[PDB]
Amino acid sequence: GEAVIKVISSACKTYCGKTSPSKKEIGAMLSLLQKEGLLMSPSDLYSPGSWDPITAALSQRAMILGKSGELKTWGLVLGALKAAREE
């Protein structure tokens, strides 16, 4: 699943950022997930709707992130997940 990674990375930005070069792409992708209880690798993608875990993650400690303000980075990461649901 070359996406499991590309997704986490791209998704992060490509998801709710698809445009920029990578202001927080790989960042949140790793820092976000790797900082939201997703230190199990980009395998998260290996599971459908595994962006719900990163949601309650930052929520559990939205004050643990701060690469663009606080949760702004997540927003792009998570906000994207919600974007998928919105289509």
CA atoms within 13 A on the CB side of 14: 10
Convert 50-63 to b/e letters by CB count within 10 Å (16 or more is b).
bbebbbebbeeeee
- CB 15, CB 77: distance < 8 Å: yes
Assigned CATH class of 1-87: mainly alpha
Q: In whole angstroms, what is the distance from residue 1 CA to residue 46 CA?
A: 7
Cα(45)–Cα(33) distance, rounded to whole angstroms?
11
Q: What's 26's DSSP letter?
A: H
What technique solved it?
NMR
- Reduced to 3 states (helix: H, G, I; strand: E, B; else coil), residue 51 is coil
**Residue ranges per structural domain of the chain:** 1-87
Taking each helix axis as running N to C, give the angle between helix 72-86 and helix 52-60, from 0 to 180 degrees, rounded to the nearest 10. 150
| Cα distance between residue 86 and residue 3, in whole Å | 21
User: Do 76 and 46 contact (CB within 8 A), yes or no?
Assistant: no
Displacement of CA 67 from its chain's centroid (Å)? 13
